[PDB]
Symmetry: C2
Subunit: 626 residues, 2 copies
Amino acid sequence: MLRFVTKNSQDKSSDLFSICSDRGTFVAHNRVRTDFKFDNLVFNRVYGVSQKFTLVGNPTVCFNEGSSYLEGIAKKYLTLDGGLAIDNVLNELASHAYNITSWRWYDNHVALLMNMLRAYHLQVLTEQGQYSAGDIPMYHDGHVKIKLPVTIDDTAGPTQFAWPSDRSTDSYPDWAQFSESFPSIDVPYLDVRPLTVTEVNFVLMMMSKWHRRTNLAIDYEAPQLADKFAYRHALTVQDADEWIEGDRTDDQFRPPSSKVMLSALRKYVNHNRLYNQFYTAAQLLAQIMMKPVPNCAEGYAWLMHDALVNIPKFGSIRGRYPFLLSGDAALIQATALEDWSAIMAKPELVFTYAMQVSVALNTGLYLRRVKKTGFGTTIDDSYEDGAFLQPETFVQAALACCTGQDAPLNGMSDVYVTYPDLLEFDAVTQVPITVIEPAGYNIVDDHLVVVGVPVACSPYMIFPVAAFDTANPYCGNFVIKAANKYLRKGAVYDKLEAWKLAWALRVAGYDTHFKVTKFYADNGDTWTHIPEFVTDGDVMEVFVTAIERRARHFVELPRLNSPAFFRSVEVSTTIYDTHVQAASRINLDYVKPVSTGIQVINAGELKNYWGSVRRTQQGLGVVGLT
Amino acid sequence: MLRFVTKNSQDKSSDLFSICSDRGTFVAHNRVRTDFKFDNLVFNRVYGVSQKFTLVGNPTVCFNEGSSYLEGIAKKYLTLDGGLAIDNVLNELASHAYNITSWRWYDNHVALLMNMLRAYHLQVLTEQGQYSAGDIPMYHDGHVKIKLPVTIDDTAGPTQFAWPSDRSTDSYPDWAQFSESFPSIDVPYLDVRPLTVTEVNFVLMMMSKWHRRTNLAIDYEAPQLADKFAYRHALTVQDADEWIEGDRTDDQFRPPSSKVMLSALRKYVNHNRLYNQFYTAAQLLAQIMMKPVPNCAEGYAWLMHDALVNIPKFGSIRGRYPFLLSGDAALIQATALEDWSAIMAKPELVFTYAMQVSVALNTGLYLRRVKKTGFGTTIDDSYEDGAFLQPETFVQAALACCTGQDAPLNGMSDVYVTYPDLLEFDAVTQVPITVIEPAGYNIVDDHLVVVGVPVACSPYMIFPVAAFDTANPYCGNFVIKAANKYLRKGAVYDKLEAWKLAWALRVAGYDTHFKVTKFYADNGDTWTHIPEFVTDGDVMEVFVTAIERRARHFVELPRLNSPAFFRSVEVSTTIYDTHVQAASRINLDYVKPVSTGIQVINAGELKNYWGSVRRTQQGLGVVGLT
């Protein structure tokens, strides 16, 4: 994910942002200058654009077991594939020799790593002093009032990060202390030797069942990862045990700080060599993290829609034997290693990547819906069902169709964040609406309806996004061309050319009408949504009438509508300064990972989904890392 | 004056209009189409313009004797010059031979002809049913209320044309009947043989003193033309005598109708061969007749200013001997003969020529004032005192400077209509003003002041007027050219180019601002007055800022102010239909005069002022007819 973020703008920028919330939402502000050069008369207008985001969500999570991955053990303990070298293990150690015939090796700690990630982010948020239940923004446009419900009330919601479980009200895993060389039960054991006492306590107690107490998307409900397990440690750690039996009071046993929690993460991962599984965990957390708050009224359907996540069941063989984590670690992906090094250099790469993936996902789904019609795209590709069926490649396909670069795959099989109710282009949403005054809006029975996925963000977190083959507002610059034909009342225009002209005029300060009435563009973002009527098929020409001016006008432009006054206006848009408000630039040359004691493979296996998906000219598809 | 009127537009048009009044004022409406061709995109806007006129005036008339003109007698009764051939007269017949040594021959009937002209026009006006005292229009512009006083109140003023004199309250001339061949007294006698009884009665009784009873300009006060005289007629006519001695009541002795009055005019003139004197009379009446009502507030100074007229004293030798009017009439100007034939073909040539001369006079005085500064004109000619000193060539010089064609001279020496208080460029006027709301206006002590002569009309009765050497709104068409230099806030412009641009934009529908604030142009005429500030010297460049639009907008035009959007707009204005409202086309081929029994000379004598004045390139001056 490091390559994706560092390639959205340029290899030199590498701009990162920290987590911030304000009752569950935050706003990312920008400052952008737009040019207008025509007849060697360069004009410009500098303005600020704001795209706010919300961390409130209610994703659905299913905990279903999957494949077993052993890409962290020594070379001699692995065969030519991911399967362990059982003969080597036994020629090293009996009853176990006969027992092994009945010991499946299901080692997959992705659920644990994701749990630690969300707990760390929650603790960072509460030490930042703004952790709360989280509430959706209340959007009101003079004509329509909307307010999506949330389960947990913010005011009564907790302000401090409590432990996910309860006071012994629910059962807890039967943990144990392990120091021998003989695994006694096929139940998984962990190896937490480098961890300190408090880190081990946090790990074991958070293994227990998690309860959802806030509307935060990373606060989803999760059951206990394993009913029984043991940890291979030098000493027994039992402070959390005193807490469950009802001895340690809340004040002395509180969730550990962010620094120690991140340290426990680091120790766990780089002692068990879980770089691949942690990369998968970070990918899933980034894809589940947050959604943008829509400026337009109909964009709230994106907020109401809930993702579906498939986290594999927890299993471990690392702690079963102590020599497995020794030796030379094998089959570690270079992308996973570099991503791990970067995220432990700065732990907010996940946050900035999550915001970028949210914006890219929304725009990719919407542009798939639009480019189905034939707007901007030459080839009538199978956008509907091509690479969006594969749940693991769903969000990556959306990112590829939006941005055009190689979206990083989950790196793990049978894990995905998927919107099942979004593959169809007929899917509707009933957003609650208390209409203030009647206007142009498809308001039927107190809820307007939307078709497919709407726009809820603006392509400003990722600006140079190459959505279309030709120049467009999504691209850096475009040239407004002559109309197809001019008439008395106006001129006809192609779908894309008309939208480009309307966008440029809205930035300049002109309101643009059309027939077969307004090009919508909300203030505070000044990005013109694609018109609903032109979105559908059978419409190839747009009649532009009445290019009127607005109350506030910035750049004064020719008519471009009358043949006499049309001029080849060439525009150009560049983003200058961004600052979230509820930098931190990274340096690749200082975060390079540890190549020693690690065997690194550049390529991956398509079964395990170690690759990327790129929007080819002939159609987007999955490709190998090679 | 026929050539002047028929050459203002074209030899084919020859458009004439009848007299009409509405409480002393009338309005002449037009319908004019203005073009706007640029980039091969011809645009046009059709609109109506109205220029109202007023017949109310109080001219000052001085009755001072002048030269004696004998250009109607037979050839044998004249010498090589205007002097009579006394030897021929005597070798034709004594005591008279000795008496003649004491008989000056002062024959000049111009006062009589002018009196009959004004009486005929008044009778036409009263039979039209709209004769009254006449009142000045009350102009009000939301900011300023003005109403010039008039001596005679309209409501109590007479509605029927009464006889100019009173009921024997004033003395009357001692008329007599003459039938012999011997003039008994050096007192003048008239020859009215072809006239009927009623025509003779009207002539003799109107010879008596005239009293001013209305505010009409042609109703000026005049004394009795001669204390004593006799008329050479077959029979004595004494009905007016019964009227003066108090016998004939008013009802039976009333002013004769228009037809019989015009018939008396015709008989008198073409029996006494007074074509030259009648041409002079018509010229003077046309120059005194009426003034335009000013659309702009400061233009009423033209209304307050009063002309000065020098009518020669009445004298006659035609009726002294009966053979003088016989023979071949000698020394008759072709222009006078053709003008006489035209005015007796239709008697409203005088009215249309008077309206045209009024508009041309106002515009000529104003353009002399403007072109003194250097606006539009290359040569700094002596506009102030060159040909405007000669009182007889004053109004003709104004017409020449305005229109550019040969203004017809008075054709008589020591006769003129002159504004003595107008030769100076510093002359001021105190127009009464009840100011409604304060605005841009030089209002000092209840009266704004004006400097020189203002614009009170628009060049629409005579449109193709060539005021300036270069193309201008006064000309048919002009091309708006590129600015001298363009700046951030606007562009600088020459005096004339800026005024042309402002006029074109006001016709199109754009309001034009400038600095070193508005280009004034009143509705109902949509002609833009020359700005006061640019009128004076030391100002050669005008800064044009803010070409804003108006409430009502007709032709949509490029900025012409910014270098990027400037386009070579070419305009064109043509007048289509005019109709006064309180045609009548003439046909030259049917009004050609009687060449038989008349000796016609094309040339004239500069002493007698038989010529014209043309605006030469090097300067306007009097030229001969040749």
